Symmetry: D2
Subunit: 30 residues, 4 copies
């Protein structure tokens, strides 16, 4: 499953991009 996370993905995930949500920038992680 994919999630938006700050500041980085958790171990086992890969960052595919970035999310813009609630006026902040997140890692897009799957």
């Amino acid at each position: 499953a994919c999630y938006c996370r700050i500041p980085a993905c958790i171990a086992g995930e890969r960052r595919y991009g970035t999310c813009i949500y609630a006026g902040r920038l997140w890692a897009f992680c799957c």
Copy 2:
């Protein structure tokens, strides 16, 4: 147990203040 959340606390929680974590500001929620 408290948490840092963006942009707001969840139901069940009261906001006590703000967190500064990973270069972002978060609601500090318990």
Copy 3:
């Protein structure tokens, strides 16, 4: 001229979009 500004454009400018710069989200103002 166009600028990235937080949290909003200044009087006389119009927001055309958003900038991603230095891990924050800005108004794109011209």
Copy 4:
């Protein structure tokens, strides 16, 4: 005169701390 800047102070300035302004964190520079 001090200023709030993202992501860092400019030349001529010393960072004294951090600003919390408009939901973002800034370098506090004089």
